[PDB]
Amino acid sequence: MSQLAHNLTLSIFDPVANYRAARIICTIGPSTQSVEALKGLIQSGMSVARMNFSHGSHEYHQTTINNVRQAAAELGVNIAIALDTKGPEIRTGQFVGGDAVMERGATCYVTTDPAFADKGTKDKFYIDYQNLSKVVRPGNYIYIDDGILILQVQSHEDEQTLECTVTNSHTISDRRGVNLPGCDVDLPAVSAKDRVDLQFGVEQGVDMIFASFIRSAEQVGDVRKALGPKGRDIMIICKIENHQGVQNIDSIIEESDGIMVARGDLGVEIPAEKVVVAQKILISKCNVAGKPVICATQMLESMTYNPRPTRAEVSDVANAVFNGADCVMLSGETAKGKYPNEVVQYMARICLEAQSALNEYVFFNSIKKLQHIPMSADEAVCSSAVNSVYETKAKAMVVLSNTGRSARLVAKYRPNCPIVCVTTRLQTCRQLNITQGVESVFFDADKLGHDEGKEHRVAAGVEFAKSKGYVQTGDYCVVIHAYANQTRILLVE
Amino acid sequence: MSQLAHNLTLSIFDPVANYRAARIICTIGPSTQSVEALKGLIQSGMSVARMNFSHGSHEYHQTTINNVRQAAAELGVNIAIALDTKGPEVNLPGCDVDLPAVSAKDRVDLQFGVEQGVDMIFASFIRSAEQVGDVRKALGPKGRDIMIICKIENHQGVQNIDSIIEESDGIMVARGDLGVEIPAEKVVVAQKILISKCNVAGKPVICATQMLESMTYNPRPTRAEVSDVANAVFNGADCVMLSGETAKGKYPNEVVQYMARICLEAQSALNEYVFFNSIKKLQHIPMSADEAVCSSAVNSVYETKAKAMVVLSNTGRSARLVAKYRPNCPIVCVTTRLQTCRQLNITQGVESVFFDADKLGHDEGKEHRVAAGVEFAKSKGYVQTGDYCVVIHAYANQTRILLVE
Amino acid sequence: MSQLAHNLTLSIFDPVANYRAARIICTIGPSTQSVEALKGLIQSGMSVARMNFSHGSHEYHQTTINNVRQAAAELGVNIAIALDTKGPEVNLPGCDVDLPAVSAKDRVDLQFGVEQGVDMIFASFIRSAEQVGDVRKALGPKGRDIMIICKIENHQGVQNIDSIIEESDGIMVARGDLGVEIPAEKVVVAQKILISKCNVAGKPVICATQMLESMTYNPRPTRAEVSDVANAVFNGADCVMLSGETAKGKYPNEVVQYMARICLEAQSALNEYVFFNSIKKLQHIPMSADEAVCSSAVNSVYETKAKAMVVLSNTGRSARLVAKYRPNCPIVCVTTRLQTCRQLNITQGVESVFFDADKLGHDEGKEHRVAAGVEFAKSKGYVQTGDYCVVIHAYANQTRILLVE
Amino acid sequence: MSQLAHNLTLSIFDPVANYRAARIICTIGPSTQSVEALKGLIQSGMSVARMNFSHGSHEYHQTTINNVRQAAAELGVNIAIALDTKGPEIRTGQFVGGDAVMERGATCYVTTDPAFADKGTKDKFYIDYQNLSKVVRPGNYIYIDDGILILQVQSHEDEQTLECTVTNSHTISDRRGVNLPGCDVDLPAVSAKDRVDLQFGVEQGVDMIFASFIRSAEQVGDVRKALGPKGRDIMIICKIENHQGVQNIDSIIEESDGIMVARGDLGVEIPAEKVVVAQKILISKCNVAGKPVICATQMLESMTYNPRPTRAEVSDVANAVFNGADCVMLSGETAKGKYPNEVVQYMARICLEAQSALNEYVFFNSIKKLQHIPMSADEAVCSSAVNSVYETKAKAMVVLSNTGRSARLVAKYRPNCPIVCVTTRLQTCRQLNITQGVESVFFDADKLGHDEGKEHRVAAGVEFAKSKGYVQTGDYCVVIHAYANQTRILLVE
Numbered sequence A, D: 001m002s003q004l005a006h007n008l009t010l011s012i013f014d015p016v017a018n019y020r021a022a023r024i025i026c027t028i029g030p031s032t033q034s035v036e037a038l039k040g041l042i043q044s045g046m047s048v049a050r051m052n053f054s055h056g057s058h059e060y061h062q063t064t065i066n067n068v069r070q071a072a073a074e075l076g077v078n079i080a081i082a083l084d085t086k087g088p089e090i091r092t093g094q095f096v097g098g099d100a101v102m103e104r105g106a107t108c109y110v111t112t113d114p115a116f117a118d119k120g121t122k123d124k125f126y127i128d129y130q131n132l133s134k135v136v137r138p139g140n141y142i143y144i145d146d147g148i149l150i151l152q153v154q155s156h157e158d159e160q161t162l163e164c165t166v167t168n169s170h171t172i173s174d175r176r177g178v179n180l181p182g183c184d185v186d187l188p189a190v191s192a193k194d195r196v197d198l199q200f201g202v203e204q205g206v207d208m209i210f211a212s213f214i215r216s217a218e219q220v221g222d223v224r225k226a227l228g229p230k231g232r233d234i235m236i237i238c239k240i241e242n243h244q245g246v247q248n249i250d251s252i253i254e255e256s257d258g259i260m261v262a263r264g265d266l267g268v269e270i271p272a273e274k275v276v277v278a279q280k281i282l283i284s285k286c287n288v289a290g291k292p293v294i295c296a297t298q299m300l301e302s303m304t305y306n307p308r309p310t311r312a313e314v315s316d317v318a319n320a321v322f323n324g325a326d327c328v329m330l331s332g333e334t335a336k337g338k339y340p341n342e343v344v345q346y347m348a349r350i351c352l353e354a355q356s357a358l359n360e361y362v363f364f365n366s367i368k369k370l371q372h373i374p375m376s377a378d379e380a381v382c383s384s385a386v387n388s389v390y391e392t393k394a395k396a397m398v399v400l401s402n403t404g405r406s407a408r409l410v411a412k413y414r415p416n417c418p419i420v421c422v423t424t425r426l427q428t429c430r431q432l433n434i435t436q437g438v439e440s441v442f443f444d445a446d447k448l449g450h451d452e453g454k455e456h457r458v459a460a461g462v463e464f465a466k467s468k469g470y471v472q473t474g475d476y477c478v479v480i481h482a483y484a485n486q487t488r489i490l491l492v493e
Numbered sequence B, C: 001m002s003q004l005a006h007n008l009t010l011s012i013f014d015p016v017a018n019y020r021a022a023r024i025i026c027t028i029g030p031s032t033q034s035v036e037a038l039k040g041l042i043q044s045g046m047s048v049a050r051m052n053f054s055h056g057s058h059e060y061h062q063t064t065i066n067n068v069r070q071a072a073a074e075l076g077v078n079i080a081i082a083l084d085t086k087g088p089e090v091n092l093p094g095c096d097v098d099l100p101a102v103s104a105k106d107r108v109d110l111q112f113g114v115e116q117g118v119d120m121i122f123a124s125f126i127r128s129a130e131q132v133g134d135v136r137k138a139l140g141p142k143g144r145d146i147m148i149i150c151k152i153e154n155h156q157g158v159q160n161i162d163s164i165i166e167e168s169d170g171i172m173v174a175r176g177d178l179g180v181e182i183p184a185e186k187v188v189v190a191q192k193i194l195i196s197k198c199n200v201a202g203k204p205v206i207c208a209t210q211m212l213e214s215m216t217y218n219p220r221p222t223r224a225e226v227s228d229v230a231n232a233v234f235n236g237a238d239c240v241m242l243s244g245e246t247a248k249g250k251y252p253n254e255v256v257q258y259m260a261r262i263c264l265e266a267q268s269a270l271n272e273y274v275f276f277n278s279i280k281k282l283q284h285i286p287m288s289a290d291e292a293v294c295s296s297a298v299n300s301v302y303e304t305k306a307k308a309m310v311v312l313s314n315t316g317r318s319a320r321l322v323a324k325y326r327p328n329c330p331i332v333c334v335t336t337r338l339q340t341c342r343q344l345n346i347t348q349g350v351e352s353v354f355f356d357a358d359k360l361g362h363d364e365g366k367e368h369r370v371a372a373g374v375e376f377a378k379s380k381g382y383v384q385t386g387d388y389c390v391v392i393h394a395y396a397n398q399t400r401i402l403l404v405e
């Protein structure tokens, strides 16, 4: 019950853990779409395949869906498939000649008038967010092109047009994206494109949605609506990208099935040092709520084209694990990168190294101390189950969970041993790929039996733990099953 | 306590702490050697000026020494001067290197440091405990008050860390040098181990090398570099170091200003009570009076929500011993020695007020010193009328909980 | 937790607990030997009938045995029968007495106990651990399931208490006998030591002699006697004993009714969580599965505010192991053995439900036994629809937190 | 931090403490009034002389006041003098022939009509509490003569007379005292006699009042008023005698300077087993509030005429200490008893024995955990001071306190070592005699100096601790002085 105290007992020469808890999400692109590249990516350490719907067509992502499924079947594994929406955007219009040279100290005008959409100049151009005039006060800032161009609003010239000062010299081109830092953007949760994309994901049976630009709890339910009745079991992981998402994180977590800390997106509007703190907050909040949380963007970026990443990047990845992250994400590194297998292998190695220094008992003790008394049964059973692991120095857990609820609930309390989930659902096997320290074994109930006495499923989990070398004769194994409200401290034969 | 539970209570839109605890060490080079550039550094947040004795001549470093003192005197502040030795010198990564502790150049350079009254030594490439004794005897009797801070550069320094910490006056964690033979992931962990051990031992720890290296020739650092600095603070670092960014860099002031900004932001998130409670719980009972006095004083801060501490300490020993227990308020050290003011610049959360015992009084009742400490705490806006201030003085064996008038 | 902090939360005008945890042992004599007088005792709160073999003949005690079984059968309950030996026999108070563990009469009386199927022995004047083995071999192989409860009567019993507790199945604290050679004030302390040690060992402890002695010939006890009983409960006694008050007394029922009243009132004040937390904190980590299971089960009671526990235990070992951790709710033991029902009458906070495995089923899935336990807990009004009930069963290695229908 | 855990480490053969913390109050009567009997009583273990103003005249108690002061001066000690008020009472009237034979099942009538005061019979008699008709409902009980005669009210016969059933056979005589269990008695805080007696106590300079029959917080201030301006420094110890006092204990403690648990008085109206619990509550509440609490009445009663007390009585005394009592009281045992020196000696021995088994750290930890944060300075300094004792295994404390406030405040947190109080006031030396674990040293400020640097007073305390053999060269001594807001861990030379 102290990371500091745990640090004192550590030695960087002692062998690393016999299991890696943290999970790796790789983005699939030109470098990784083929079956063999995926087979290499899985073997490297991929648990979840991310599809970026900012780019590519339905036919393109269809082959991704196909290839992942074939590479999963050929290696005898279950791989989660994630759909990352493009999301709603605020962009500039077009320009005459393509460019707009913005000199420092110059005055320019931004308008929501659609007549200027096709004919923008350096003096006056279009921004497609109709509510820009009522959202932005004078004194506020407009960021254009990944926050490189910074304009300051001086005054409302009319109903649609704002007078601005160019604060720094930078050239912009056609349809560059804009940000309104410190302004409340009221764009709909899902774009017209999203609605079409989300329906494709449901029709193809995606395991989860990484929902872009989530700003309030109301929006989480809008994505739910957009998924329809046939996708009620698809997880919604909400991407926090601006101050709104940070400000409303409590109610958003409550509605979401999980959170993605998108540091790159956040760092456009918020200073980088505050985003680092926002990361700490968001991860800890998710750990308390039992929901999966992903540390995403700018993870090991230099390795996209270099054989090895910078020392600071490695540090960043380890501290993601130290923060308490369920998952670490890779974007361009696996999508457009030169070292797809290599970047995943090293990230896996960094997670494992951090995990070997991490003190899980701190997580267990903190989360348990925060729980309101009286606890509900499911909460009591899972926390006690993890307590028993520490109490008896058990070497594995077996959780029987159909939906994944109690598997996640157990994982929350952070035992210092592998969790084996035995489940009657393949969707569950896949969706648990974003929860740390859990590995799933599928039990075909319609083939093998209803297993009402639970004997077979428990036996299946114990065998898996024996096969991976977690337990042996004489070891204790904490079994928790049916929610799930029952616990045994089993002696492994 | 926990960091986790504290993280839940936080908002990034809240105002940051009204004081910065972590200290900034700047390497002095061509782009920062002039008195006007040093004034820029001091105002930007430099607490310690470092001289890299791998490069340059005694005359070049004499200029550094002279200009630092001139710059500090003009701004009415006290700045530490550090001498970073060249050391003994290709690397062997599963072999134990038995090169001499200090080179012939080192023994000469170290004598130069004594003559020029440096505050501290950054002794390079320390592998064992006896090697600290070599730096000690090389500094002679005239430099026995100079702090020896050990640079951990290889596995040997890590493996023997406990004996090295005991002999030294502090530790420098040179990530880059460690990275040559030890994988980067293991260096991140070694950093935690080394920093945590130094906190328990109550000895200054410096997080050095590859801090904001991109900012040497770029106006802003990479996002990963920012996090590295913040996490250095979160680990429990007393100090953060800038090498090439201030010595040969293009933005000497901006980098120091930004490192200051990151440290303060990280500190605003940091739960000081975790440090206090952890370090308290590791203490053998029975305690020694001075240890018990200092830990109780910090406990009294948390229990009464005191907004400042005042520590009377000539040597700075009890000033360091108080900072060890990490109160969530500023510490003000009232000292009769100017070298202590400078030497405390590597200890976090402490600010020094010089009291001229030669031209005021010995202050046996200690009233004038304490009042001077409170007035500085009023001056910086830490405390106002109605606030509590925990005063610890003389091993400093007396505690007062004082109501600010 | 604390008793102190709990004391602040209390009001004497609040209703008392809906169950009595402490158990009452009654000595059977002339004024209570008849089946109608024993029915009076059982209804008044007798859990254990004691036979003093210092007086009386085998035929007299045979009547006691017969009448107790008849009385219990008519009231549909299970009552324990205890055989308190005469022992070896002036006293020496700084000298170690090496009289034989059991006398010739004892060996004969103990064989009588086996033949008549007594539940437990109160072995008199136990001084060492080997003396327990003497009682064991005297009881033979046919009485190997009979509990040996040791009477601590002199300093030797106190000095060797740790080895005696380990060998025995429980301890009797005979204040009066201790008082002969040990000052009364030191006996009060010895009582605490002995009772606390027995709680940690998870073995029954009886507070005996001079309990309500005034009530033998008076309608009410002295105020000091009342407090003595209450403080016996507060100390952590499983049982409280009546000697002459029920055997030769004038108010056999009233005294038992009053002892019951005092125990319940004391229990209403008692903080069970202090016992749970203290006894938990003394456990060596790693734990054994059965120990961890039982302690977790009680922890689950406190965390979910379960109103009852159901323990499946043939021998009663896990029933005792659960009661060891002192939940603030009733424990219900479902057992296939009638001797266990009787033997659990010296363990606090446990009530037994007999399950006839010969004329119902073995119940491998254990469903019928658990349901029988819940139904009794419903019957006594401990739990209703919506309440939680912690079920521990098979070393009993499986825990369930069940919602009552 | 567990009495249970502490019990495990105990051995009844290990030598007892080097100091007795608990304080003994002896009642002075026919057996103890003379100087030599008091000199024997002090040497036996008396700290406070109790004067019972239920009996005796002003001239009688005057000699007590005198003799105590002479016996104190002759032994070089400071002895506290306590005035115990008679209090307001509800009594029956007189009877014809002196007796009234009350047979079970009989009907009788109680009236508040003053015409029946001098001529009572078995059928109808007087009770002097005018508000009896409005206070007592039918179904309630009237206790007469130490609760031996029990009447049950059947009905209101008229405005002044109640019909009653005699529930048990018992003969009563003239002016026997009555109790109304479960009824709210609204008699004034102080009787006419009390007002005269309290003024005598102020004029003679008594250290404290044991105020009888305290039922509410308002009443505590009435005694204060009755003491006048010249007695504002006289402690008010409130005697809790019925359910009202128990029900209102929180506000009564807040106003009082301390509490007396009068078990005998309480046990008249409340079942004995509930009074035992009431004792636990009241003592613990006082310990938290920092006020002295006395366990009184029926302490070692059989020793009034027997050479040795019953085993249960010894047990009762020890458990008084275990409960957390500051003081243990003696009534008839020292007043009218045959063994005045003997009863005090044994009580002292029992307290010391209990103290040797008691775990003070439990008291320290519990009380400290309950303190609201932020603490005030005085609270912080004293608790830290006691913490330092445990932290450094110090062997004595020195508290510089003029009024006694910080001495009491330190004593509250229960260090496992003697507290030495250095004070500029003799009244303070005396009044601290009811606070456990504290011994006072008088420092004549007008004679020796104002000691603004505190050096002399601290030196005086340390010497006393050395003289009593508490500390020696090498030992740590925790000094706390000026309220008092300063602490030193001093190395004893």
Ligand SMILES: O=S(=O)(O)c1cc(S(=O)(=O)O)c2ccc3c(S(=O)(=O)O)cc(S(=O)(=O)O)c4ccc1c2c43
Pocket: A188, A189, A192, A195, A222, A225, A226
């Ligand atoms: O914008 S359109 O492309 O015409 C368009 C088409 C369809 S579709 O026909 O069902 O596919 C929509 C279905 C459901 C919508 C919901 S809701 O979740 O169902 O309540 C809310 C909004 S709103 O913008 O937030 O008010 C919608 C806006 C626009 C929609 C749809 C919305």
Ligand SMILES: O=S(=O)(O)c1cc(S(=O)(=O)O)c2ccc3c(S(=O)(=O)O)cc(S(=O)(=O)O)c4ccc1c2c43
Pocket: D188, D189, D192, D195, D222, D225, D226
């Ligand atoms: O009852 S008497 O003997 O005539 C009598 C004589 C005096 S004395 O002249 O001052 O000595 C009283 C002084 C002060 C009194 C106060 S108070 O504390 O001053 O407010 C209250 C009440 S009360 O009964 O509660 O209303 C008093 C009742 C009776 C009093 C006195 C009372």
Ligand SMILES: [K+]
Pocket: A087, A212, A241, A265
């Ligand atoms: K985006």
Ligand SMILES: [K+]
Pocket: A355, A356, A357, A358, A359, A360, A416
């Ligand atoms: K670990």
Ligand SMILES: [K+]
Pocket: B086, B087, B124, B177
């Ligand atoms: K080097």
Ligand SMILES: [K+]
Pocket: B267, B268, B269, B270, B271, B272, B328
């Ligand atoms: K902070």
Ligand SMILES: [K+]
Pocket: C086, C087, C124, C177
């Ligand atoms: K005997």
Ligand SMILES: [K+]
Pocket: C267, C268, C269, C270, C271, C272, C328
């Ligand atoms: K209770």
Ligand SMILES: [K+]
Pocket: D087, D212, D241, D265
């Ligand atoms: K009275």
Ligand SMILES: [K+]
Pocket: D355, D356, D357, D358, D359, D360, D416
């Ligand atoms: K003690």
